[PDB]
Amino acid sequence: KPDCPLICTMQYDPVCGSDGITYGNACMLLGASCRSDTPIELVHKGRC
């Protein structure tokens, strides 16, 4: 599973991550995959 970032931004860059969720940003995901529930990933850089 990926890792976590170091505070990306608030430039709403909603990306659909392999799990079924649109994260505020692919960065906010690294934080998720790091402490969400399972090994998440990225599929589309937008609203799916």
CATH code of the domain covering residue 16:
3.30.60.30
**Is 29 within 8 Å of 40 (Cβ atoms)?**
yes
Identity of the amino acid at 29:
L
The span from the CA of 11 to the CA of 1, in Å, is 25
The parent domain of residue 2 ranges over 1-48
**Is 39 within 8 Å of 17 (Cβ atoms)?**
no
Q: How many residues does the chain have?
A: 48
Expt. technique = NMR
Q: What is the 3-state secondary structure (H, E, C) of the chain?
A: CCCCCCCCCCCCECEEEECCEEECEHHHHHHHHHCCCCCCEEEECCCC
The span from the CA of 37 to the CA of 44, in Å, is 20
**Is 44 within 8 Å of 23 (Cβ atoms)?**
no
Burial pattern 4-28, b for ≥16 Cβ within 10 A else e, equals eeeeeeeeeebbbbebeeebbbbbb
Count structural domains, the chain.
Answer: 1
Q: For tokens 């995901």, what's the residue?
A: 29
